[PDB]
Amino acid sequence: WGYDLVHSLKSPYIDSSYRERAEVLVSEIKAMLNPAITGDGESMITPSAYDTAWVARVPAIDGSARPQFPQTVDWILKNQLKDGSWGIQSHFLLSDRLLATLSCVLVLLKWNVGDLQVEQGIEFIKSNLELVKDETDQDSLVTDFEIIFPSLLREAQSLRLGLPYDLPYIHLLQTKRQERLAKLSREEIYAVPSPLLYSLEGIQDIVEWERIMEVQSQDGSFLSSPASTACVFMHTGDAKCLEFLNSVMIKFGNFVPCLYPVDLLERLLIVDNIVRLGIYRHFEKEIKEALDYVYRHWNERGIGWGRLNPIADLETTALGFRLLRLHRYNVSPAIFDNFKDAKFICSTGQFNKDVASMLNLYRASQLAFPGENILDEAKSFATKYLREALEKSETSSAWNNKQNLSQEIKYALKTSWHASVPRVEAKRYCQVYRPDYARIAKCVYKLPYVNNEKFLELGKLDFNIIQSIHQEEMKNVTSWFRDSGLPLFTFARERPLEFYFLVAAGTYEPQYAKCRFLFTKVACLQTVLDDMYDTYGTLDELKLFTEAVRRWDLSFTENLPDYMKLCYQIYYDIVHEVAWEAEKEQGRELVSFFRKGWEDYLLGYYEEAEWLAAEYVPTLDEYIKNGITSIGQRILLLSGVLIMDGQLLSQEALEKVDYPGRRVLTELNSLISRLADDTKTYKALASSIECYMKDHPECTEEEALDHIYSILEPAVKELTREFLKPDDVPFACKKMLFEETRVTMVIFKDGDGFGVSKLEVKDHIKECLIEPLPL
Ligand SMILES: [Cl-]
Ligand SMILES: [Mg+2]
Ligand SMILES: [Mg+2]
Ligand SMILES: [Mg+2]
């Protein structure tokens, strides 16, 4: 550890060829995504054999005895899998194969063709149905399986196909079907668009076709389902229905997907994945183009996965809310009123979709601004839902286990967005992201623009390049620390890597090396100043040191004890090196501004020193006032933020994020740091807890702690708004301040009062800065 560990590191990814390879990946990715955000190749989605077979049913509109779309028949005949089923070969899901195979077998029979495919299709259905012993064996269910399959299977039964119609599992499905159909308002199907419009082909005996057009989508589809739309068409001859089938055939050629379009959801999944992989900074233009389009279609009623959906979708709406707000678009969490009742519902659709909706709601809820009570409710509700989902047997289906759903859920619940290490989360996601990820709706499908090899390849490479660059910086850091004189103060612990990590883990970009470096010097100085003021020094010594702080005269230190003479000199050098760099970057005078900041900080320390010497316990108001200034986060933050390559902060601009006395970014960080620190430790002079109990003699320790959190929680919402707020402050500066707060919040998370876990601090440095991703 320390100097020796760091200088032994030898990362290959520093060589310029790796960055050059990464730039080819970036260009290839932009080319791949171009049709999805700029062109017309939108909605890239795999075939649905099940839906294709429904479209193949439509008889020629000229009245002749052939299909209107004979290419779909040809497709089906040519795409049977080796086991006799239809579906995507890479991923086997019983309900998907059962539904799709029975659908294809029936359409082939209609047109009197593919006798061999039909024979093999029937064998698969019969064979696999007889393997189901109990419920646990059915696996994950595609959308509305319980409703559609009994209906489709009755159709087969009327044709007397050789299927096991009398199996227990079959009877169970009918039972489940009746159960779903009971809670159904029939009269409302025609008045209020609902999830069931996605599967009309499964409830033909219920639907009055002459009334169903009122809930048709503007593009002629029924909830974007080709199968469902085709069904309505054969019953009504509706022209807009036909136009929708035509548009889908024109787009895909000889097949259809199970959802079309998916323009809104797809765009958001692309951005989500790019962001979580840590590679967003390469694709600013594409992310703006994607989100601008989503925002154009953002409305008070929420959004569906496609822009023409007649009803909003919680999964897509919650994802959109989060990404839009995260990217500084103005959205209101009142859109979640659309998914309420007399509160929330979303306990109806297919399981994976329901879980995805609640994960997205849970995540969106963490981006709350002050006074946004509905997000507080959303959080509670989503948390409760997700905790229950873990206890559900569906969560442990073979399919869900293969995708580690329970792990994803558990990880989501233990993960607080505010208390996160950004570089570490991206690293972890590169380890979970799947190029061949399969999703569920009416059938199993993939979105190749969202899930592919290139994303991951760039993700891993980019992470390793960034990390190797940081490893070289850590050599400079440790090299500087060693010759700095700081190691001489043996009453203070040496933590240069921990302070480096504090900034590098959030502000990682290669151009901000000077920012990380100066930040690390100041934090190293501060830990020594801190131990000097609250532990090592005597009041009389500290009065002398505090006086020299006021004078800014090196010659004046002749009065000080030897150890303080040295401390003053290092302090004086570091302050003025930071100042010089800042003036270089900013092009204006900043020495006076920095000196004032250091004065306030250390006078704060001295006031605290006087309190200790007098065994004085301040009121909580006094404690907080002093603690915001003396915790020293402010002057530390300024020492990094004013020296970010190419980021100009006028005085006016700076005062929007730094202004002692106001609730701006640096002030909120100071307050949050002080209190998150107290809540984390305090048990191990006097803290905020102890101060409240002096102010309120009768209150318990529990009441005292609870009150501290009542100050914390609102502060964190304000931090979030100040960060994301639109303004004329360089966003990179705001992000630096925010990300430093986030890493701080990781360090002090879960405040039981015992103290900080030093062992986990090290593990974070290891994961983030030491060990690369395997390629
Ligand atoms: Cl998968
Ligand atoms: Mg202290
Ligand atoms: Mg201390
Ligand atoms: Mg402490």
How many whole angstroms from 726 Cα to the centroid of ligand 2?
35
> Is residue 530 a known part of a binding site?
yes
Ligand nearest to the CA of 536: 3
Instruction: Please count the CA atoms within 13 angstroms of the CA of 465 that sit on its side-chain side.
Output: 19
> Is residue 681 a known part of a binding site?
yes
Resolution of the coordinates in A? 2.2
**Long-range CB contacts (within 8 A, 24+) of 607-615:** 608/533, 608/534, 608/685, 609/533, 609/534, 609/537, 609/539, 609/542, 610/539, 611/685, 612/534, 612/685, 613/539
Helix, coil or strand: residue 571? helix
Ligand nearest to the CA of 688: 4
Instruction: Please count the CA atoms within 13 angstroms of the CA of 194 that sit on its side-chain side.
Output: 16
Q: How far is CA 11 from the centre of its chain?
A: 29
Q: Is the dihedral of CA 147, 151, 152, 157 positive or negative?
A: positive
Rg (CA), the chain: 32
Q: Which residues are paired to 59 by β-bridges?
A: 67
Ligand nearest to the CA of 681: 4
Residue ranges near ligand 2 (ion) with Cβ within 5 Å: 530, 534
- The residue among 80, 56, 112 whose CA lies nearest residue 249 is 56
Q: Read off the DSSP letter of residue 340.
A: B
Q: Which residues are paired to 225 by β-bridges?
A: 222
- The two tokens of residue 304 are 């569906």
- Per-state percent for the chain, helix, strand, coil, to nearest 5: 65, 0, 35
- The residue among 487, 480, 521 whose CA lies nearest residue 502 is 521
Q: What is the distance between the alpha carbons of residues 550 and 729, in angstroms, rounded to a whole number?
A: 32
Instruction: Please count the CA atoms within 13 angstroms of the CA of 214 that sit on its side-chain side.
Output: 13
- Strands in 119-197 per DSSP E: none
**H helix count then E strand count, the chain:** 33, 2
Report helix angle 16-37 to 263-276, nearest 10: 170
Strand duo 444-445 + 439-440: pairing? antiparallel
Q: What is the distance between the alpha carbons of residues 206 and 278, in angstroms, rounded to a whole number?
A: 49
CB within 8 Å of 699: residues ≥ 6 apart: 692, 693
- The residue among 194, 186, 248 whose CA lies nearest residue 222 is 194
How many whole angstroms from 615 Cα to the centroid of ligand 4?
16
How many whole angstroms from 475 Cα to the centroid of ligand 2?
29
Q: What is the distance between the alpha carbons of residues 455 and 270, in angstroms, rounded to a whole number?
A: 10
How many whole angstroms from 681 Cα to the centroid of ligand 4?
7
> Is residue 134 a known part of a binding site?
no
Question: According to DSSP H, which parts of 506-630 are helical?
Answer: 513-531, 539-551, 562-586, 591-613, 620-630
- The two tokens of residue 137 are 């064996």
Ligand nearest to the CA of 632: 2
Give whole-number Cα distances, 70 to 56, 59, 66, 101, 510, in Å. Answer: 7, 9, 7, 18, 57
| Structure-solving method | X-ray
Ligand nearest to the CA of 748: 4
Helix, coil or strand: residue 222? strand
Q: What is the distance between the alpha carbons of residues 478 and 471, in angstroms, rounded to a whole number?
A: 11
Q: What is the distance between the alpha carbons of residues 190 and 209, in angstroms, rounded to a whole number?
A: 9
Chain gaps in the chain, named by the residue before each (C–N > 2.5 Å): 342, 684
> Is residue 750 a known part of a binding site?
no
Report whether 139 contacts 398 (CB < 8 A). Answer: yes
Burial class (CB in 10 A: 0-12, 13-18, 19+), 652: exposed
Ligand nearest to the CA of 609: 2
- The two tokens of residue 564 are 């303080």
How many whole angstroms from 404 Cα to the centroid of ligand 1?
9
CA torsion, ordered 199, 203, 209, 215, to nearest 10 deg:
-40
How many whole angstroms from 526 Cα to the centroid of ligand 3?
10
Domains of the chain: 1-46+262-465 (1.50.10.130), 47-261 (1.50.10.160), 466-775 (1.10.600.10)
Q: What is the distance between the alpha carbons of residues 360 and 365, in angstroms, rounded to a whole number?
A: 8
Q: What is the distance between the alpha carbons of residues 65 and 715, in angstroms, rounded to a whole number?
A: 71
User: What end-to-end distance do the CA atoms of the chain give, in Å?
Assistant: 25
- The two tokens of residue 528 are 């020594």
Report whether 6 contacts 471 (CB < 8 A). Answer: yes
CA angle centred on 581, ends 577 and 584, rounded to 5°: 140
How many whole angstroms from 659 Cα to the centroid of ligand 4?
25
- The two tokens of residue 703 are 């009441």
